[PDB]
RNA sequence: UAAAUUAUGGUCAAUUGUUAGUAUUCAUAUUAAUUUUUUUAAAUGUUUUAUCAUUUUAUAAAGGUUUAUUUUUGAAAGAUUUUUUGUAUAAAAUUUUAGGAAUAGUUAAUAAUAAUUUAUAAUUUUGAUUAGAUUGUUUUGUUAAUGCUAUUAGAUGGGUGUGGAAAAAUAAAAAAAA
């Protein structure tokens, strides 16, 4: 639980703590076991998990993050229970063993529904059809594998849950004897995650789990990783990363728009990142939670023209072939569509080679929040415009 | 049938005392007033009695009743009525004592309106922190003196002007030039020389 | 009232008059009152030797009497072995 | 005060709190101070017999009440009558002496906590390995721990007058129970109380009988 | 130190005392005299009692005699009422003439 | 009755209070002291259903209940719920955890912008768990878990827990004990009235006084600190003693007929599990001795010696002389391990009580052996040898001035003398126990066996009557067993032990009960006589009232005290916020014909139709 | 204010010392009535257990300044009837006062003299009880009284008890000596160091009975007027001891 | 200043007597009450005791109270005992007069029970104090009515300091120790 020594950890501290010499385990089975242990908990086990000796704002941020983790884990528990109930119902209705239902297909479903309808069980046939149709969506073992790994990574990062998965008094199902198993699967799974997924923190921040410092640092790390993988001669100096001449590959961390923007003032145009690739300039701006500040945040056409002219002046790129454009990113997360657009526009990478470079990209399936329609409309009308020339 | 609260009250009356007071009190009885003093020489300096007077506290027409629904009920969850109050400090003349004027609501069913009446309380401040003009929250407590049973729980809004005047050496609030009359007769000024 | 009567009679231990006692004797809550006596038979006469002889003839077991008075005075909702076994957890203890 | 402005005042208070949190933030955690006692309690005045300087409920244990103690043992040379004659034996008395206590304080604790008219009847002094301990020195200077064997050497001619008036249950809270000869550490339980009697509510509130109706709350 | 503790009921003065703060408005000369003359009067009384034994003894004996002979020494409801003239205002005039007014404070 | 503690806890919950951990601990301890293990489990269930996370003290109390009940599943569930996080103290950490939660308070802005349910503070026990678990009493939790596993027979789990506890106690620093809390009982200062009766107020007997005791104690009590005040090595010794005590309790539970003094011949001889039990206990003792080197010489082991003697007296059928020899060997081994010369310790009151109990067990017998005479003793019993051993050990105890005698020790001596048939137990009782002790009826229970052996029935009767007069005088009411023993010889002695009133009541009650049982017409249940229907202050279903609105011609609304009317029925002056919300939508409205006043969520969706 | 600091419940009360009826005067026999049972209990304890500082070589010597402060409560025994100086002697010849020492004289040790010593300032009384003859009770070799020549066994030993003149009886009350030690006289027969071990025979079975108890003489009801039902009158079974509910031996 | 878009290719109504509840007679009142030809019935000796004594027997004196008066408690209940057993009193709102003004054994603080002191004190025109009237908090009458008009909740400093608690010297339907 919460202790005086307990403190939140960073990614480096997590890697330092959860370490394994070697070996390969069944990550899917380990994840299922850990999630079953989490679901076995009562609501009281989430109470004393915030370290006391911290400032109030930091404690509030930690509380919000832990509440988000609890909500997501409860939603996944409900989804898992519904999946298991559907599988059990299909098995009972059809007579097949409980393991082959996942491998059965639509033709088998048609045959079984026809058999039930012929036997006169129209109600059971309809229930079977509905159960199979809704089971096709959530029947995969790794339905939300990435998000579940991010949840477990966040639990590890909290630093108050690593000891909550051991010292359990358990009965051996074979010999019917009581013992206390000291094997902790949570540590093994977190060690496997940190050993295999090198960008697990980046995925965690992109999914929106990071409530303290947003995701801008992870975005910068992702962008500089792509830039170095492309250039192969990338040189970094503080908040500016530049390639070795040739084709222009420049990443500039101008400032953080959240602190740069000041309410009640009039100043239009504050960019977060500036990316120069070839003769193109892209202004990557992270939106704010305040809908009245986005209009200030987006720079004007005159500002874009002036920035392009300054790029021509400094880098010597001829004014004839110079394009500039904006790129608005969601405020608290980074969805799959936004990431794909970022890869396509900024780094000029097609989907196939982007997935070749990044394994976790194809399984990243985060979508935009349906509630925020102001941001969605602004992002559409900002990303559907053509490049500003000269 | 749904029985009104009058039925329950009558039930309680019948339980406590055998039966209920249903005797048809003769409300039509002719009440009379026989004068005993002169036409204008009634023995009182404030009010003069010349007819039958109303009796009772809650039987006065027009009716006045308490109105619990006000700012205090909107803000605080009172364990008992009038346990917590909010007011302004209106005097610190007494040592370790702060006088607070609070507001409550009186309801007039005949006119269907409510009014804010003012009451003064002797709140207690130990360390002498209250300054006149402070918006304070006060709570009931034990008996402290002959008329002190409230204490300043918290100071919501300190009077910066009063504190700065005290630091400068002046009174927290300058005394009003008007006030109470010493008599019915008009108090005339005396701008006369010693000879006159 | 039955619940209130039992509360005042057992917990608070209130007194009792004779007319209410007779009425409750009719109601079956209480046995017939002390004053509900007929003239058909006079009061019994007690003899110590006869009483002792009857007690010796019919003396109950110590444990049996203790259990009877425990059930009458202390809790009468005593769980059996089956109830205790059903209460005991058998599932994986979490 | 006018109640129509409550919503506006709530909005302004929310804005002020948000500005405070955004700008001032929180410059590090502050150590929690143990709360004191409040003079202002509700109800009628209480008698001076029950004034224990605590008029609120607090389940936790405050820092001032916490004390650091060491389980010391003091051994006395006693004599028992075996079938032949008198034989030497050792009698050990257990005390809880604070870490910052002097030898004189340890001796006083032994005298208080002997609870037997055979050990501390006469005057005595504490020593270790024959070397007498300075009564003006503390346990830290001597390095005394629970393993340290402290012997007591008595003088028969001098008798130890009972000059102890401090109660053995005395502490900072000053909540001392008189006529209690059990040490504060020896007995610790929620023992049932037989002097009083349980009391049930006899005066009803609102409902008296017949139909409940509203209940008159 | 401007807020009371709702859990324990402590006032803002108690909270400031526990936190070691100080919320005392600039005192005027009369207030300073009020806070300062208590010790002076106590020292004067102690000095008088230690310097004039017979006079102090006579005064204390007379005070105790009048206290013991007072008609209302018993602490019943009437003696325990905080405001006798206001609460038992029916007695004023007809029976008791000590108080000419039934109201002295804001109650 | 013991049920009242649970009743008061339930009443506390019903009256809208949050039962604190001290309340739960007191309820469980009272129910355990009354033997209501099921009711203690019910108290724990109540605590869980209140969504209260127990503190470590509550955990320890519940585990004490579990080990007393012998049920391991309850303790295992409790461990899996609220005990998988408890850890021992490490040398590089602060011993007393500082207070974390600042007391609840509201600032100026919060008092206005927060809702009333956020601004409300009732003493929720879940907010104080962190500051109640700041003293780290986890070693007691581990000891309780080891005890419950030993009781349940899970040897591997018990070994795991005991090894963890031992490795903690031998290598980790002692936690700071929690100080006693004097704010739990409202006890008046001093004594308001100084009147106090003398110890010789009654000219017929000496009696105790509230100031000082003069009748001597009836039970031997070990003078030792609490577990929280014990040191790590001292707590290890205490844990060994507690494990042995649990072993003895389980043995008694398994063989109840083999432990009572005078029931049958099965008591005299060993059971079939005695060798294994003694081997386990001796192995544990040797493990403790090996683990603790010369440090053991500075630890109070009187409790350990007493429990070892009790185990080797009950589980193993050893003699009093053997028990005394074992205690002396234990003390001399302790002295030799401590390398002391001529400074051994003495047996304490509890150790001597165990030795005397062993002698009484040797001298025990079966009363009449269900044959109306010829009481059966143990095969191979030597009254001369046993009585000589008892005499010399009693003389040794008396010569030792630091052992304070008690009623239980004197009862053991009297029982041994009766069993040996010395015809002097009556003299010993009348000289040592009668005048200066608060003896109970067990003394006369045994002294009746000796009285039966008098040559003349007249002497037997006179002794019995004098014993009864002693009970009447020294406030030691005759026990039911003693009265029945005297009753069984009524044909010979013609001595009465039942009062005229009791016999008169009993005859009528027995005749009526027999007649009622034989009668079949009145065997039907009577609802008026069998149960109480409803005992809560409020009805269990909504009958419609209250109205919370006025009606035509009712000017007084709200009614204030004792009136549920909250506002005028039809029109009111303007209201603000929640008052307006309640007056327009939320308040009850009986006269509404479409729907009754709705139930709170979620009890409204299920009665939609 | 000062009036509302506390309520008037449980006011400060005058101590029993000032009240005359509360305190006990030494001249009255009640003083000896209070102190005799303590003396006999102390002697019984000392005849079976070694009390550390109950027997001294000579009277306790303290400076006259501290004499009044320290002496009250002191109690010790000496050999011979030597009395401390600066003490006016008053022998107790009153039978009403002497009757309370009857049990002590008969059962413990024959009481020879009772004296009260009043100091010069009349603020520190001494009670001297001189006993003649050996102890009636058996004396253990380890007992404190074994040291005295005239106790274990001229043949006179004195007990001195210092108190204050006018005090409530609790000041006289002595409870530190109410320690109960067993008497091993009935058990000395079977001890190993006693040559009577092979004499007694264990009677392990009750003898067979051929006759019942002798019938009591025929009950004769009383003749004089009785006061009434003692059980209803809350009188103990004989006005002496017992319980009212368990009535016995009262005219019936 | 959007300009008359065109298979008009579905018309055939309503009522079946069923309901979300203050409804108004300008008065002569099938409204209430007092008033005319004279309405009756129950009483007064509590008991017990250890005998010139002790034990058990507690608000209807009615007065003239509008910032007012509110309280069972150490007795009893009551249980095989502490060791008395045992937190009763205090607050908020509502408070009369045709010809309206000052009030006072006073307010707070206090190392001060039983105030030799300190203060720029307290009450009040938002209606005080004195004087008059009147037993305070849905109970009566009447009306379409949040209007008007009634009402013994029978309540308190010098008579004994007893008693757990004064209310203790008319009564008031009451069972008080077999
Ligand atoms: Mg008047
Ligand atoms: Mg009022
Ligand atoms: Mg009583
Ligand atoms: Mg007025």
Automatic annotation (TrEMBL), chain A:
Query: What top-level branch of life does the organism fall under?
Result: Eukaryota
Protein name, per record: Uncharacterized protein
Automatic annotation (TrEMBL), chain B:
Ribonucleoprotein among the record's keywords?
A: yes
A Gene Ontology cellular-component term: ribonucleoprotein complex
- Superkingdom of the source species: Eukaryota
GO terms (molecular function) for this protein are: structural constituent of ribosome
Ribosomal protein recorded as keyword: yes
Binding-site positions, Mg(2+): 30
For this UniProt record, give its keywords in alphabetical order, as a comma-separated list. Answer: Metal-binding, Ribonucleoprotein, Ribosomal protein
Q: Which GO terms describe its biological process?
A: translation
Q: Which family does it belong to?
A: Belongs to the universal ribosomal protein uS17 family.
Full protein name: 30S Ribosomal protein S17, putative
Automatic annotation (TrEMBL), chain C:
Gene Ontology cellular component? cytoplasm; kinetoplast; mitochondrial small ribosomal subunit; mitochondrion
Protein name, please? Uncharacterized protein
Q: Which residues of the full protein are shown?
A: 95 to 188 of 188
UniProtKB/TrEMBL annotation, chain F:
Question: Shown portion of the whole protein?
Answer: 154 to 762 of 812
What is this protein called in UniProt?
Uncharacterized protein
Q: Which domain of life is it from?
A: Eukaryota
């Amino acid at each position: 639980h919460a202790t005086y020594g307990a403190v939140p950890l960073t990614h480096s501290q997590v890697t330092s703590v959860y370490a394994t010499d070697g070996g390969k385990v069944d990550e899917l089975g380990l994840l299922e076991l850990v999630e079953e242990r989490i679901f076995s908990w009562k609501l009281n086990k989430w109470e004393m998990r915030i370290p006391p000796n911290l400032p109030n704002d930091q404690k509030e941020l930690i509380r919000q993050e832990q509440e988000n983790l609890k909500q997501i884990l409860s939603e996944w528990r409900k989804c898992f229970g519904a999946l298991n109930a559907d599988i059990l119902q299909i098995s009972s209705l059809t007579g097949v063993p409980k393991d082959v239902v996942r491998e059965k297909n639509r033709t088998w479903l048609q045959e079984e529904v026809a058999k039930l309808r012929w036997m006169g069980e129209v109600n059971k046939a309809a229930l079977l059809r509905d159960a199979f149709m809704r089971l096709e969506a959530f029947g995969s073992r790794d339905f939300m594998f990435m998000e579940r790994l991010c949840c477990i990574y966040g639990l590890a990062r909290q630093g108050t849950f690593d000891e909550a998965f051991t010292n359990y008094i358990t009965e051996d199902p074979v010999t019917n004897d009581i013992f206390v198993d000291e094997r902790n699967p949570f540590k093994e799974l977190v060690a496997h995650i940190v050993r295999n997924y090198s960008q697990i923190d980046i995925i965690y921040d992109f999914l929106g789990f990071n409530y303290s410092e947003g995701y801008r640092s992870s975005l910068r790390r992702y962008m500089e990783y792509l830039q170095c993988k492309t250039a192969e001669n990338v040189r970094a100096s503080g908040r500016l990363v530049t390639g070795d001449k040739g084709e222009h590959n420049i990443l500039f961390d101008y400032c953080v728009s959240r602190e740069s923007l000041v309410s009640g003032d009039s100043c239009q145009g504050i960019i977060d990142f500036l990316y120069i690739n070839g003769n193109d300039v892209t202004l990557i701006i992270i939106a704010s939670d305040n809908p009245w500040l986005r209009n200030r945040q987006l720079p004007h056409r005159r500002q874009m023209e002036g920035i392009a002219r300054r790029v021509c002046f400094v880098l010597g790129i001829p004014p004839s072939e110079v394009r500039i454009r904006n790129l608005l990113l969601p405020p608290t997360y980074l969805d799959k569509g936004s990431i794909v657009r970022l890869n396509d526009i900024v780094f000029r990478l097609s989907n196939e080679q982007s997935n070749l470079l990044i394994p976790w990209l194809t399984n990243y399936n985060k979508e935009l929040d349906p509630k925020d329609v102001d941001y969605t409309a602004l992002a559409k009308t900002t990303n559907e415009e053509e490049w500003l020339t000269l | 049938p749904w029985w009104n609260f009058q039925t329950e009250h009558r039930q309680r009356c019948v339980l406590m005392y055998g039966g209920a007071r249903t005797k048809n009190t003769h409300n039509a009885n002719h009440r009379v007033f026989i004068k005993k003093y002169k036409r204008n020489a009634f023995p009182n300096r404030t009010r003069h009695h010349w007819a039958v007077s109303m009796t009772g506290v809650l039987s006065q027409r027009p009716r006045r009743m308490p109105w619990p629904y006000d700012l205090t009920s909107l803000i605080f969850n009172q364990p008992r009525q009038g346990s917590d109050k909010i007011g302004y400090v209106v005097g610190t003349s007494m040592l370790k004592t702060a006088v607070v004027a609070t507001n409550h609501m009186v309801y007039y069913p005949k006119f269907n309106q409510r009014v804010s009446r003012t009451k003064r309380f002797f709140a207690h401040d130990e360390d002498l922190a209250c300054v006149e003009g402070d918006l304070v929250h006060i709570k009931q407590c034990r008996k402290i003196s002959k008329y002190k049973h409230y204490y300043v729980f918290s100071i919501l809004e300190p009077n910066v002007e009063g504190r700065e005047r005290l630091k400068l050496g002046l009174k927290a609030v300058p005394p009003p030039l008007f006030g109470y009359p010493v008599s019915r007769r008009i108090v005339k000024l005396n701008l006369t020389s010693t000879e006159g | 009232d039955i619940d209130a009567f039992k509360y005042w009679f057992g917990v608070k231990r209130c007194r009792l008059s004779m007319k209410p006692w007779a009425l409750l004797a009719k109601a079956g809550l209480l046995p017939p009152s002390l004053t509900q006596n007929s003239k058909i038979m006079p009061k019994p006469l007690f003899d110590k030797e006869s009483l002792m002889r009857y007690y010796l003839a019919n003396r109950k077991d110590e444990d049996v009497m203790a259990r009877e008075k425990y059930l009458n005075y202390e809790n009468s909702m005593v769980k059996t072995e089956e109830e205790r076994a059903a209460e005991r957890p058998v599932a994986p203890y979490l | 005060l006018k109640a129509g402005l409550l919503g506006h005042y709530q909005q302004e208070a929310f804005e002020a709190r948000k500005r405070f949190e955004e700008s001032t933030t929180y410059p590090g955690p502050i150590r929690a101070a143990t709360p004191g006692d409040t003079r202002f309690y509700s109800g009628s005045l209480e008698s001076i017999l029950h004034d224990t300087d605590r008029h609120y409920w607090r389940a936790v244990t405050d820092d001032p009440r916490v004390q650091h103690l060491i389980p010391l043992r003091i051994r006395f040379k006693i004599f028992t009558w075996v079938t032949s004659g008198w034989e030497q034996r050792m009698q050990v008395v257990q005390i809880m002496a604070p870490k910052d206590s002097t030898i004189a304080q340890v001796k006083d604790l032994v005298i208080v906590e002997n609870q037997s008219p055979y050990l501390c009847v006469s005057s005595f002094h504490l020593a270790i390995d024959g070397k007498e301990l300075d009564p003006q020195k503390t346990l830290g200077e001597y390095g005394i721990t629970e393993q340290s064997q402290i012997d007591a050497i008595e003088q028969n001619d001098h008798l130890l007058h009972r000059d102890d008036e401090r109660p053995r249950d005395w502490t900072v809270d000053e909540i001392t129970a008189e006529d209690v000869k059990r040490s504060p550490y020896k007995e610790m339980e929620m023992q049932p109380l037989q002097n009083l009697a349980p009391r049930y509510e006899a005066r009803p509130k609102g409902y008296f009988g017949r139909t409940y109706y509203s209940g008159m709350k | 130190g401007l807020n009371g503790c709702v859990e324990t009921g402590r006032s803002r003065s108690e909270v400031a005392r526990d936190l070691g703060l100080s919320y005392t408005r600039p005192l005027h000369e009369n207030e300073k005299k009020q806070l300062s003359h208590q010790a002076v009067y106590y020292e004067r009384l102690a000095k008088f009692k230690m310097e004039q034994p017979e006079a102090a003894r006579a005064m204390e004996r007379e005070r105790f005699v009048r206290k013991f002979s007072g008609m209302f020494v018993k602490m019943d409801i009437r003696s325990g009422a905080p405001d006798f003239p206001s609460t038992y205002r029916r007695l004023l005039g007809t029976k008791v003439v000590r108080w000419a007014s039934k109201r002295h404070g804001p109650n | 009755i013991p049920q009242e503690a649970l009743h008061w806890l339930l009443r506390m919950i019903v009256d809208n209070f949050n039962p604190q951990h001290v309340h739960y601990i007191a309820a469980m301890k009272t129910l355990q002291s009354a033997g209501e293990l099921d009711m203690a489990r019910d108290v724990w269930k109540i605590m869980e259903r209140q969504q209260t996370w127990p503190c470590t003290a509550t955990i320890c109390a519940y585990l004490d209940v579990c080990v007393e009940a012998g049920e391991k599943t309850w303790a295992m569930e409790a461990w899996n719920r609220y005990c998988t996080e408890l850890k021992f103290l490490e040398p590089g950490e602060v011993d007393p955890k500082p207070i974390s939660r600042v007391p609840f308070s509201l600032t100026r802005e919060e008092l206005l912008y927060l809702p009333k349910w956020k601004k409300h503070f009732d003493h929720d026990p879940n907010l104080d768990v962190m500051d109640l678990n700041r003293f780290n009493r986890t070693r007691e939790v581990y000891l309780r878990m080891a005890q419950v596993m030993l009781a349940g027979g899970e040897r591997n789990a018990f070994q795991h827990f005991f090894t963890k506890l031992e490795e903690a106690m031998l290598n980790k620093p002692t936690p700071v004990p929690e100080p006693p809390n004097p704010h739990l009982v409202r006890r008046p200062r001093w004594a308001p009235y100084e009147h106090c009766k003398s110890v010789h107020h009654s000219p017929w007997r000496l009696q105790n006084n509230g100031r000082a005791l003069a009748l001597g104690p009836p039970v031997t009590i070990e003078d030792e600190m609490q577990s929280r005040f014990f040191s790590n090595d001292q707590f290890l010794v205490h844990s060994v003693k507690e494990v042995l005590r649990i072993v003895l309790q389980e043995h008694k539970r398994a063989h109840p007929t083999e432990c009572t003094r005078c029931k049958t011949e099965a008591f005299f001889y060993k059971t079939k599990d005695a060798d294994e039990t003694l081997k386990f206990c001796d192995d544990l003792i040797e493990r403790l001795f090996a683990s603790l080197g010369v440090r053991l010489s500075n630890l109070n082991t009187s409790s350990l010696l007493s429990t070892i003697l009790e185990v080797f007296r009950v589980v193993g059928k050893e003699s009093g002389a053997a028990l005394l020899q074992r205690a002396n060997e234990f003390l001399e081994r302790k002295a030799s391990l401590g390398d002391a010369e001529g400074s051994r310790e003495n047996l304490t009151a509890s150790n001597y009580l165990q030795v005397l109990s062993g002698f009484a067990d040797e001298s025990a017998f079966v009363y009449n052996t269900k044959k109306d005479g010829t009481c059966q003793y143990k095969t191979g019993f030597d009254p001369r040898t046993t009585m000589r051993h008892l005499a010399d050990v009693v003389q040794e105890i008396a010569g030792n001035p630091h052992v304070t005698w008690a009623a239980d020790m004197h009862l053991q001596v009297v029982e041994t003398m009766v069993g040996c048939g010395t015809m002097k137990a009556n003299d010993y009782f009348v000289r040592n126990v009668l005048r200066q002790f608060s003896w109970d009826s067990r003394f006369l229970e045994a002294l009746y066996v000796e009285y039966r052996r008098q040559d003349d029935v007249d002497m037997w009767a006179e002794l019995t009557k004098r014993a009864l007069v002693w009970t009447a005088r020294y406030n030691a009411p005759a026990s039911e067993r003693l009265r029945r023993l005297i009753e069984d010889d009524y044909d010979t002695i013609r001595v009465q032990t039942r009062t005229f009133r009791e016999l008169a009541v009993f005859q009528f009650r027995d005749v009526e009960e027999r007649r009622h049982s034989r009668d079949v017409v009145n065997e039907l249940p009577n609802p008026w006589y069998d149960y109480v229907a409803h005992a809560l202050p409020f009805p269990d279903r909504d009958a419609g009232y209250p109205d919370e609105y006025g009606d035509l011609g009712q000017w007084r609304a709200p009614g204030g005290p004792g009136s549920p009317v909250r506002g005028p029925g039809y029109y009111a002056p303007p209201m603000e916020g929640e008052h307006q919300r309640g007056y327009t939508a939320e308040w009850r409205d009986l006269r509404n014909p479409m729907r009754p006043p709705e139930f709170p969520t979620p009890w409204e969706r299920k009665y939609r139709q | 204010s000062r009036r509302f600091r506390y309520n008037t419940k449980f006011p400060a009360l005058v101590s029993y010392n000032k009240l005359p009826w509360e305190v006990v005067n030494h001249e009255t026999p009640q003083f000896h009535m209070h102190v005799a049972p303590h003396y006999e209990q102390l002697l019984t304890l000392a005849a079976s257990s070694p009390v550390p500082h109950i027997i001294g070589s000579k009277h306790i010597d303290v400076p006259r300044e501290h004499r009044l402060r320290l002496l009250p409560g002191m109690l010790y025994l000496l050999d011979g009837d030597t009395l401390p100086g600066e003490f006016t002697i008053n022998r107790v010849l009153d039978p009403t006062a002497l009757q309370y020492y009857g049990r002590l004289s008969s059962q413990i040790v024959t009481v020879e003299a009772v004296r009260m010593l009043v100091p010069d300032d009349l603020r520190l009384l001494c009670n001297c009880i001189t006993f003649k003859g050996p102890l009636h009770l058996p004396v253990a070799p380890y007992a404190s009284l074994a040291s005295l020549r005239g106790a274990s066994q001229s043949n006179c030993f004195t007990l001195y008890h210092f108190v204050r003149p006018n005090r409530p009886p609790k000041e006289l009350q002595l409870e530190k000596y109410y320690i109960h030690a067993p008497c091993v006289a009935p058990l000395s027969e079977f001890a190993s160091n006693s040559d009577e071990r092979g004499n007694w025979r264990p009677r392990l079975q009750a003898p067979k009975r051929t006759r019942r108890a002798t019938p009591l003489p025929a009950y004769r009801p009383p003749q004089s007027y009785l006061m009434g039902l003692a059980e209803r009158l809350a009188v103990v079974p004989g006005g002496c001891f017992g319980r009212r509910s368990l009535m016995w031996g009262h005219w019936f």
